[PDB]
mmCIF file of C-alpha atoms and ligand atoms in Angstrom:
data_model
loop_
_atom_site.group_PDB
_atom_site.id
_atom_site.type_symbol
_atom_site.label_atom_id
_atom_site.label_comp_id
_atom_site.label_asym_id
_atom_site.label_seq_id
_atom_site.Cartn_x
_atom_site.Cartn_y
_atom_site.Cartn_z
ATOM 1 C CA UNK A 1 105.443 94.389 137.920
ATOM 2 C CA UNK A 2 106.643 95.419 134.418
ATOM 3 C CA UNK A 3 109.646 97.016 132.657
ATOM 4 C CA UNK A 4 110.088 98.798 129.419
ATOM 5 C CA UNK A 5 113.379 99.895 127.959
ATOM 6 C CA UNK A 6 114.525 101.174 124.512
ATOM 7 C CA UNK A 7 116.939 99.282 122.610
ATOM 8 C CA UNK A 8 119.332 101.132 120.097
ATOM 9 C CA UNK A 9 121.339 99.811 117.203
ATOM 10 C CA UNK A 10 125.003 100.215 117.920
ATOM 11 C CA UNK A 11 125.869 101.235 114.326
ATOM 12 C CA UNK A 12 124.423 102.124 110.966
ATOM 13 C CA UNK A 13 124.081 98.542 109.930
ATOM 14 C CA UNK A 14 122.044 97.304 112.917
ATOM 15 C CA UNK A 15 125.072 94.948 113.765
ATOM 16 C CA UNK A 16 123.572 94.576 117.323
ATOM 17 C CA UNK A 17 121.357 96.423 119.857
ATOM 18 C CA UNK A 18 122.205 97.947 123.300
ATOM 19 C CA UNK A 19 119.755 98.500 126.057
ATOM 20 C CA UNK A 20 120.714 100.435 129.233
ATOM 21 C CA UNK A 21 120.788 98.467 132.500
ATOM 22 C CA UNK A 22 121.190 99.751 136.058
ATOM 23 C CA UNK A 23 123.474 97.543 138.152
ATOM 24 C CA UNK A 24 124.301 98.204 141.906
ATOM 25 C CA UNK A 25 123.692 100.814 144.483
ATOM 26 C CA UNK A 26 124.059 103.678 143.545
ATOM 27 C CA UNK A 27 123.095 102.643 140.099
ATOM 28 C CA UNK A 28 125.871 102.040 137.465
ATOM 29 C CA UNK A 29 124.274 102.176 134.032
ATOM 30 C CA UNK A 30 125.890 99.831 131.465
ATOM 31 C CA UNK A 31 124.723 99.269 127.813
ATOM 32 C CA UNK A 32 124.087 95.586 127.383
ATOM 33 C CA UNK A 33 123.264 93.466 124.407
ATOM 34 C CA UNK A 34 120.131 91.533 125.186
ATOM 35 C CA UNK A 35 120.653 88.035 123.933
ATOM 36 C CA UNK A 36 117.860 85.447 123.614
ATOM 37 C CA UNK A 37 120.530 83.055 122.347
ATOM 38 C CA UNK A 38 122.374 82.800 125.681
ATOM 39 C CA UNK A 39 121.871 82.793 129.383
ATOM 40 C CA UNK A 40 124.655 84.655 131.175
ATOM 41 C CA UNK A 41 124.541 88.298 132.281
ATOM 42 C CA UNK A 42 128.067 89.486 132.186
ATOM 43 C CA UNK A 43 129.788 92.888 132.204
ATOM 44 C CA UNK A 44 132.997 94.592 131.484
ATOM 45 C CA UNK A 45 134.328 95.453 134.976
ATOM 46 C CA UNK A 46 137.034 96.871 137.213
ATOM 47 C CA UNK A 47 138.385 93.279 137.185
ATOM 48 C CA UNK A 48 138.624 93.048 133.388
ATOM 49 C CA UNK A 49 142.263 92.725 132.160
ATOM 50 C CA UNK A 50 143.190 96.362 131.499
ATOM 51 C CA UNK A 51 144.554 95.658 127.980
ATOM 52 C CA UNK A 52 141.232 94.119 126.927
ATOM 53 C CA UNK A 53 139.145 97.195 127.905
ATOM 54 C CA UNK A 54 138.989 99.903 125.091
ATOM 55 C CA UNK A 55 136.232 102.459 125.711
ATOM 56 C CA UNK A 56 133.522 100.329 127.415
ATOM 57 C CA UNK A 57 131.718 101.392 130.604
ATOM 58 C CA UNK A 58 132.793 99.108 133.392
ATOM 59 C CA UNK A 59 130.941 97.755 136.487
ATOM 60 C CA UNK A 60 132.902 98.342 139.554
ATOM 61 C CA UNK A 61 131.433 96.072 142.386
ATOM 62 C CA UNK A 62 133.481 97.708 145.139
ATOM 63 C CA UNK A 63 131.574 100.925 144.605
ATOM 64 C CA UNK A 64 128.169 99.069 144.915
ATOM 65 C CA UNK A 65 126.880 98.721 148.494
ATOM 66 C CA UNK A 66 124.565 95.956 147.448
ATOM 67 C CA UNK A 67 127.278 93.804 145.546
ATOM 68 C CA UNK A 68 128.278 90.567 147.166
ATOM 69 C CA UNK A 69 130.957 88.151 145.684
ATOM 70 C CA UNK A 70 129.494 84.829 145.069
ATOM 71 C CA UNK A 71 132.071 82.669 146.750
ATOM 72 C CA UNK A 72 133.970 80.164 144.570
ATOM 73 C CA UNK A 73 131.765 80.860 141.384
ATOM 74 C CA UNK A 74 133.273 81.363 138.000
ATOM 75 C CA UNK A 75 131.831 81.462 134.422
ATOM 76 C CA UNK A 76 133.186 80.974 130.962
ATOM 77 C CA UNK A 77 131.293 81.213 127.697
ATOM 78 C CA UNK A 78 131.931 81.066 124.039
ATOM 79 C CA UNK A 79 129.582 82.181 121.360
ATOM 80 C CA UNK A 80 128.689 81.093 117.798
ATOM 81 C CA UNK A 81 131.018 83.746 116.330
ATOM 82 C CA UNK A 82 133.941 82.296 118.172
ATOM 83 C CA UNK A 83 134.126 85.062 120.694
ATOM 84 C CA UNK A 84 134.478 84.326 124.387
ATOM 85 C CA UNK A 85 134.702 85.820 127.910
ATOM 86 C CA UNK A 86 135.145 84.575 131.442
ATOM 87 C CA UNK A 87 135.517 85.618 135.076
ATOM 88 C CA UNK A 88 134.022 85.771 138.563
ATOM 89 C CA UNK A 89 130.429 86.370 139.829
ATOM 90 C CA UNK A 90 128.626 88.872 142.086
ATOM 91 C CA UNK A 91 125.118 89.094 143.116
ATOM 92 C CA UNK A 92 123.666 92.643 142.928
ATOM 93 C CA UNK A 93 120.435 94.580 142.144
ATOM 94 C CA UNK A 94 119.728 94.843 138.473
ATOM 95 C CA UNK A 95 117.016 96.946 136.936
ATOM 96 C CA UNK A 96 115.780 97.125 133.301
ATOM 97 C CA UNK A 97 113.364 99.758 132.364
ATOM 98 C CA UNK A 98 111.951 100.178 135.842
ATOM 99 C CA UNK A 99 111.812 96.378 136.604
ATOM 100 C CA UNK A 100 114.197 95.440 139.463
ATOM 101 C CA UNK A 101 115.681 92.063 140.452
ATOM 102 C CA UNK A 102 117.598 91.817 143.669
ATOM 103 C CA UNK A 103 120.265 89.180 144.063
ATOM 104 C CA UNK A 104 120.754 88.892 140.343
ATOM 105 C CA UNK A 105 123.976 87.070 139.298
ATOM 106 C CA UNK A 106 126.215 89.662 137.580
ATOM 107 C CA UNK A 107 129.087 87.922 135.907
ATOM 108 C CA UNK A 108 132.235 90.096 135.995
ATOM 109 C CA UNK A 109 134.610 89.607 133.095
ATOM 110 C CA UNK A 110 138.219 88.924 133.870
ATOM 111 C CA UNK A 111 138.986 88.073 130.243
ATOM 112 C CA UNK A 112 137.260 88.901 127.098
ATOM 113 C CA UNK A 113 138.135 88.065 123.523
ATOM 114 C CA UNK A 114 139.383 90.491 120.858
ATOM 115 C CA UNK A 115 135.937 91.071 119.286
ATOM 116 C CA UNK A 116 134.473 92.229 122.649
ATOM 117 C CA UNK A 117 137.428 94.598 123.271
ATOM 118 C CA UNK A 118 137.251 96.010 119.754
ATOM 119 C CA UNK A 119 133.439 96.954 120.127
ATOM 120 C CA UNK A 120 133.377 99.994 122.447
ATOM 121 C CA UNK A 121 129.560 100.271 122.279
ATOM 122 C CA UNK A 122 128.703 96.913 124.165
ATOM 123 C CA UNK A 123 129.495 96.817 127.856
ATOM 124 C CA UNK A 124 128.298 93.179 128.193
ATOM 125 C CA UNK A 125 125.450 90.695 127.553
ATOM 126 C CA UNK A 126 122.129 90.118 129.221
ATOM 127 C CA UNK A 127 121.094 86.494 128.451
ATOM 128 C CA UNK A 128 117.427 85.749 127.849
ATOM 129 C CA UNK A 129 117.534 82.077 126.726
ATOM 130 C CA UNK A 130 116.627 79.397 129.314
ATOM 131 C CA UNK A 131 118.652 79.295 132.585
ATOM 132 C CA UNK A 132 119.813 75.698 131.805
ATOM 133 C CA UNK A 133 122.350 77.271 129.419
ATOM 134 C CA UNK A 134 123.944 79.397 132.270
ATOM 135 C CA UNK A 135 127.676 78.825 132.524
ATOM 136 C CA UNK A 136 128.289 79.582 136.225
ATOM 137 C CA UNK A 137 130.031 76.876 138.045
ATOM 138 C CA UNK A 138 129.658 75.177 140.381
ATOM 139 C CA UNK A 139 126.257 76.556 141.173
ATOM 140 C CA UNK A 140 124.347 77.502 137.890
ATOM 141 C CA UNK A 141 122.520 80.735 138.138
ATOM 142 C CA UNK A 142 119.212 82.158 136.749
ATOM 143 C CA UNK A 143 118.720 84.698 134.017
ATOM 144 C CA UNK A 144 117.190 88.098 134.788
ATOM 145 C CA UNK A 145 113.957 86.968 133.093
ATOM 146 C CA UNK A 146 113.801 83.859 135.184
ATOM 147 C CA UNK A 147 114.374 85.769 138.320
ATOM 148 C CA UNK A 148 111.860 88.415 137.405
ATOM 149 C CA UNK A 149 109.145 85.983 136.326
ATOM 150 C CA UNK A 150 107.469 85.513 139.685
ATOM 151 C CA UNK A 151 106.951 89.238 139.968
ATOM 152 C CA UNK A 152 105.853 90.089 136.477
ATOM 153 C CA UNK A 153 102.207 90.719 135.657
ATOM 154 C CA UNK A 154 102.658 88.082 132.989
ATOM 155 C CA UNK A 155 105.593 85.757 132.543
ATOM 156 C CA UNK A 156 106.673 87.234 129.199
ATOM 157 C CA UNK A 157 109.004 89.624 127.525
ATOM 158 C CA UNK A 158 108.783 91.117 124.058
ATOM 159 C CA UNK A 159 111.375 92.171 121.459
ATOM 160 C CA UNK A 160 110.432 95.028 119.055
ATOM 161 C CA UNK A 161 113.728 95.667 117.286
ATOM 162 C CA UNK A 162 113.963 98.617 114.847
ATOM 163 C CA UNK A 163 115.341 98.871 111.398
ATOM 164 C CA UNK A 164 117.842 101.564 111.527
ATOM 165 C CA UNK A 165 116.107 102.996 114.414
ATOM 166 C CA UNK A 166 115.466 102.403 118.197
ATOM 167 C CA UNK A 167 113.058 99.793 119.443
ATOM 168 C CA UNK A 168 111.774 98.378 122.745
ATOM 169 C CA UNK A 169 112.195 95.393 125.072
ATOM 170 C CA UNK A 170 109.192 95.053 127.337
ATOM 171 C CA UNK A 171 108.909 92.775 130.408
ATOM 172 C CA UNK A 172 105.624 91.485 131.907
ATOM 173 C CA UNK A 173 103.105 92.831 129.490
ATOM 174 C CA UNK A 174 102.255 92.826 125.675
ATOM 175 C CA UNK A 175 101.908 96.283 124.225
ATOM 176 C CA UNK A 176 98.799 95.836 121.938
ATOM 177 C CA UNK A 177 99.654 99.140 120.282
ATOM 178 C CA UNK A 178 103.150 98.012 119.032
ATOM 179 C CA UNK A 179 101.914 95.500 116.328
ATOM 180 C CA UNK A 180 99.338 95.182 113.518
ATOM 181 C CA UNK A 181 96.856 92.362 113.217
ATOM 182 C CA UNK A 182 97.190 89.321 115.518
ATOM 183 C CA UNK A 183 100.051 87.696 117.182
ATOM 184 C CA UNK A 184 100.407 84.075 115.930
ATOM 185 C CA UNK A 185 101.973 81.832 118.668
ATOM 186 C CA UNK A 186 103.967 78.609 117.941
ATOM 187 C CA UNK A 187 105.412 75.908 120.015
ATOM 188 C CA UNK A 188 108.895 76.006 121.511
ATOM 189 C CA UNK A 189 111.234 73.210 122.383
ATOM 190 C CA UNK A 190 113.442 74.019 125.381
ATOM 191 C CA UNK A 191 115.536 70.827 125.032
ATOM 192 C CA UNK A 192 118.630 72.611 123.755
ATOM 193 C CA UNK A 193 118.101 75.648 126.113
ATOM 194 C CA UNK A 194 117.020 78.028 123.193
ATOM 195 C CA UNK A 195 113.719 79.659 122.127
ATOM 196 C CA UNK A 196 113.639 76.837 119.439
ATOM 197 C CA UNK A 197 110.602 76.695 117.076
ATOM 198 C CA UNK A 198 109.669 75.500 113.653
ATOM 199 C CA UNK A 199 108.818 77.862 110.823
ATOM 200 C CA UNK A 200 106.221 76.687 108.308
ATOM 201 C CA UNK A 201 108.058 77.819 105.261
ATOM 202 C CA UNK A 202 109.214 80.680 103.184
ATOM 203 C CA UNK A 203 108.891 82.815 99.977
ATOM 204 C CA UNK A 204 111.308 84.944 98.066
ATOM 205 C CA UNK A 205 110.044 88.331 96.894
ATOM 206 C CA UNK A 206 106.671 87.964 95.258
ATOM 207 C CA UNK A 207 107.237 84.202 94.645
ATOM 208 C CA UNK A 208 104.993 81.470 95.724
ATOM 209 C CA UNK A 209 105.196 80.294 99.377
ATOM 210 C CA UNK A 210 107.068 77.057 99.886
ATOM 211 C CA UNK A 211 105.537 74.931 102.714
ATOM 212 C CA UNK A 212 108.466 73.204 104.637
ATOM 213 C CA UNK A 213 109.357 72.870 108.207
ATOM 214 C CA UNK A 214 112.470 74.892 109.203
ATOM 215 C CA UNK A 215 113.594 74.352 112.816
ATOM 216 C CA UNK A 216 115.626 77.289 114.324
ATOM 217 C CA UNK A 217 116.139 79.600 117.270
ATOM 218 C CA UNK A 218 114.836 83.013 117.843
ATOM 219 C CA UNK A 219 118.210 84.773 118.630
ATOM 220 C CA UNK A 220 118.360 88.565 119.334
ATOM 221 C CA UNK A 221 122.189 88.279 119.732
ATOM 222 C CA UNK A 222 122.762 87.036 116.270
ATOM 223 C CA UNK A 223 122.838 89.778 113.583
ATOM 224 C CA UNK A 224 121.889 87.794 110.519
ATOM 225 C CA UNK A 225 119.236 85.118 109.287
ATOM 226 C CA UNK A 226 120.963 81.839 108.852
ATOM 227 C CA UNK A 227 118.887 79.238 106.984
ATOM 228 C CA UNK A 228 119.483 75.912 105.154
ATOM 229 C CA UNK A 229 121.566 76.011 102.078
ATOM 230 C CA UNK A 230 118.670 75.268 99.780
ATOM 231 C CA UNK A 231 116.573 78.192 101.006
ATOM 232 C CA UNK A 232 119.581 80.610 100.843
ATOM 233 C CA UNK A 233 120.445 79.571 97.314
ATOM 234 C CA UNK A 234 116.846 80.162 96.284
ATOM 235 C CA UNK A 235 116.936 83.664 97.817
ATOM 236 C CA UNK A 236 120.271 84.806 96.152
ATOM 237 C CA UNK A 237 119.416 83.312 92.901
ATOM 238 C CA UNK A 238 116.924 86.157 92.513
ATOM 239 C CA UNK A 239 119.688 88.751 92.785
ATOM 240 C CA UNK A 240 121.692 89.402 89.576
ATOM 241 C CA UNK A 241 125.493 88.959 90.299
ATOM 242 C CA UNK A 242 125.060 87.451 93.819
ATOM 243 C CA UNK A 243 127.431 84.602 94.672
ATOM 244 C CA UNK A 244 128.848 82.702 97.699
ATOM 245 C CA UNK A 245 132.353 83.742 98.336
ATOM 246 C CA UNK A 246 134.508 81.565 100.342
ATOM 247 C CA UNK A 247 137.111 84.284 100.775
ATOM 248 C CA UNK A 248 134.486 86.675 102.229
ATOM 249 C CA UNK A 249 132.678 84.062 104.282
ATOM 250 C CA UNK A 250 129.231 84.045 102.648
ATOM 251 C CA UNK A 251 126.922 85.455 100.076
ATOM 252 C CA UNK A 252 127.785 88.737 98.584
ATOM 253 C CA UNK A 253 125.856 90.804 96.069
ATOM 254 C CA UNK A 254 126.402 94.010 93.913
ATOM 255 C CA UNK A 255 125.843 96.970 96.050
ATOM 256 C CA UNK A 256 123.883 98.466 93.059
ATOM 257 C CA UNK A 257 121.225 95.729 93.454
ATOM 258 C CA UNK A 258 117.687 96.152 94.904
ATOM 259 C CA UNK A 259 117.024 93.118 97.035
ATOM 260 C CA UNK A 260 113.776 91.134 97.113
ATOM 261 C CA UNK A 261 111.796 90.594 100.264
ATOM 262 C CA UNK A 262 111.952 87.263 102.274
ATOM 263 C CA UNK A 263 108.901 85.917 103.890
ATOM 264 C CA UNK A 264 108.879 83.259 106.662
ATOM 265 C CA UNK A 265 105.994 81.349 108.013
ATOM 266 C CA UNK A 266 104.727 81.181 111.662
ATOM 267 C CA UNK A 267 101.849 78.799 111.626
ATOM 268 C CA UNK A 268 99.499 80.028 108.987
ATOM 269 C CA UNK A 269 100.762 83.604 109.322
ATOM 270 C CA UNK A 270 103.561 85.262 107.303
ATOM 271 C CA UNK A 271 106.284 87.742 108.373
ATOM 272 C CA UNK A 272 107.757 89.762 105.477
ATOM 273 C CA UNK A 273 111.459 90.909 105.756
ATOM 274 C CA UNK A 274 111.894 93.904 103.266
ATOM 275 C CA UNK A 275 114.854 93.613 100.834
ATOM 276 C CA UNK A 276 116.536 96.561 102.422
ATOM 277 C CA UNK A 277 116.776 94.707 105.797
ATOM 278 C CA UNK A 278 119.123 92.079 104.053
ATOM 279 C CA UNK A 279 121.650 94.622 102.865
ATOM 280 C CA UNK A 280 124.613 94.758 105.243
ATOM 281 C CA UNK A 281 126.707 97.136 103.065
ATOM 282 C CA UNK A 282 130.155 96.946 101.576
ATOM 283 C CA UNK A 283 132.383 94.022 102.459
ATOM 284 C CA UNK A 284 135.151 96.533 103.050
ATOM 285 C CA UNK A 285 135.117 100.296 102.950
ATOM 286 C CA UNK A 286 134.663 101.512 99.333
ATOM 287 C CA UNK A 287 133.875 98.126 97.905
ATOM 288 C CA UNK A 288 131.080 97.697 95.518
ATOM 289 C CA UNK A 289 130.545 94.129 96.788
ATOM 290 C CA UNK A 290 127.936 94.141 99.594
ATOM 291 C CA UNK A 291 127.380 91.480 102.231
ATOM 292 C CA UNK A 292 124.020 89.630 102.408
ATOM 293 C CA UNK A 293 121.846 89.388 105.501
ATOM 294 C CA UNK A 294 120.640 85.840 104.789
ATOM 295 C CA UNK A 295 123.363 83.339 104.923
ATOM 296 C CA UNK A 296 123.585 79.567 105.038
ATOM 297 C CA UNK A 297 123.488 77.682 108.454
ATOM 298 C CA UNK A 298 125.067 74.626 106.908
ATOM 299 C CA UNK A 299 128.362 75.038 108.964
ATOM 300 C CA UNK A 300 126.546 76.092 112.186
ATOM 301 C CA UNK A 301 124.426 73.040 112.995
ATOM 302 C CA UNK A 302 121.244 75.158 113.691
ATOM 303 C CA UNK A 303 119.181 77.546 111.864
ATOM 304 C CA UNK A 304 119.183 81.070 113.408
ATOM 305 C CA UNK A 305 116.317 83.609 113.213
ATOM 306 C CA UNK A 306 118.619 86.586 114.137
ATOM 307 C CA UNK A 307 117.995 90.200 114.160
ATOM 308 C CA UNK A 308 117.323 90.465 110.296
ATOM 309 C CA UNK A 309 114.263 88.224 110.774
ATOM 310 C CA UNK A 310 113.187 89.398 114.293
ATOM 311 C CA UNK A 311 113.255 93.128 113.586
ATOM 312 C CA UNK A 312 110.471 92.535 110.924
ATOM 313 C CA UNK A 313 108.166 91.432 113.746
ATOM 314 C CA UNK A 314 106.843 92.054 117.092
ATOM 315 C CA UNK A 315 108.144 88.979 119.057
ATOM 316 C CA UNK A 316 106.617 87.518 122.237
ATOM 317 C CA UNK A 317 108.851 85.302 124.356
ATOM 318 C CA UNK A 318 106.243 83.598 126.533
ATOM 319 C CA UNK A 319 107.954 82.033 129.528
ATOM 320 C CA UNK A 320 104.909 80.328 130.962
ATOM 321 C CA UNK A 321 105.313 76.712 132.319
ATOM 322 C CA UNK A 322 105.160 75.563 128.734
ATOM 323 C CA UNK A 323 106.904 78.365 126.784
ATOM 324 C CA UNK A 324 105.647 79.545 123.384
ATOM 325 C CA UNK A 325 106.784 82.115 120.812
ATOM 326 C CA UNK A 326 104.447 84.732 119.299
ATOM 327 C CA UNK A 327 105.061 86.711 116.058
ATOM 328 C CA UNK A 328 103.084 89.660 114.651
ATOM 329 C CA UNK A 329 103.672 92.108 111.866
ATOM 330 C CA UNK A 330 104.203 95.753 112.865
HETATM 331 C C1 ZS7 B 401 138.947 87.720 140.819
HETATM 332 N N1 ZS7 B 401 138.061 86.845 141.243
HETATM 333 C C2 ZS7 B 401 137.542 87.332 142.321
HETATM 334 O O1 ZS7 B 401 136.791 86.680 143.124
HETATM 335 C C3 ZS7 B 401 137.902 88.726 142.406
HETATM 336 C C4 ZS7 B 401 137.580 89.798 143.360
HETATM 337 C C5 ZS7 B 401 138.119 91.040 143.172
HETATM 338 C C6 ZS7 B 401 139.020 91.195 142.241
HETATM 339 C C7 ZS7 B 401 139.387 90.255 141.294
HETATM 340 C C8 ZS7 B 401 138.812 89.037 141.435
HETATM 341 N N1 ZS7 B 402 123.645 85.087 120.217
HETATM 342 C C1 ZS7 B 402 124.829 85.405 119.735
HETATM 343 N N2 ZS7 B 402 125.272 84.952 118.471
HETATM 344 C C2 ZS7 B 402 126.544 85.368 118.291
HETATM 345 O O1 ZS7 B 402 127.225 85.318 117.265
HETATM 346 C C3 ZS7 B 402 126.981 86.165 119.499
HETATM 347 C C4 ZS7 B 402 128.154 86.790 119.644
HETATM 348 C C5 ZS7 B 402 128.278 87.433 120.868
HETATM 349 C C6 ZS7 B 402 127.321 87.406 121.880
HETATM 350 C C7 ZS7 B 402 126.068 86.788 121.631
HETATM 351 C C8 ZS7 B 402 125.959 86.168 120.343
#
């Protein structure tokens, strides 16, 4: 089997991407944030604290003839931005782009933190990291991809995120029309539960490539590109007036600037992030200070190849027995 679904930016900045997902019988379609940095499929629901729901579409398990409460199971997750959610668990039928999994764990939110409530466009998360990170207790559950793997034509999914435009998640096949040149594959460590890999270096604009190993994760659920402080300083030094602002929480730059590109290495191959992809707009409405899309990971503990980086590429998440990642230009 295969599936193919369009993913759409939630706003004019590409702050996140939503993909429609069918849950239950008859189908209830919710717009979920596909997140290769986590491993829980959770949804706003009829069980979510009413004051914490503000415009989202909810899953109502009592209206699904295939929903079954997973007795005694609970979940609770917190994300790198400090947001969090928790609740109970159903199994139900879940379909993405024509690919169906029966008995998928659908984690129903009882509580969500303020940033989820305040974002009316995201109805939940669909985790695509390794199932070892799944938070369901006392019986850990498998991701949608893990459940689908046996049935897929090939044990892979691909992320093709757009810049200010829709893109595609495909399951079970590699669309050879969706990228240019060749896909360069690179090793993955699953030890932390992430799609963790090592970039071979970077360049700023037209500058020379610096060969240096940068360990990090491919994370579709993180908006920005978080890299070591040395790398980030080298980037922003090429933008007149750019500075790190402790009050804002990162590098800012004059909105009048034209930003340089940023290149990262995948083996001997190179992925170029155009400068425009690094502009996240005014720090507050009407400000002439703009927020940068490349930020320091120094306070995180891990480097993160988030959407800023991934949307410059066609990315293969190869879930074979020994997983690998593939990157191509597009
Ligand atoms: C709570 N945990 C449950 O298991 C449940 C079922 C129905 C409504 C609310 C809740
Ligand atoms: N992978 C993620 N990085 C985040 O900062 C985040 C927030 C909310 C959901 C998922 C994610």
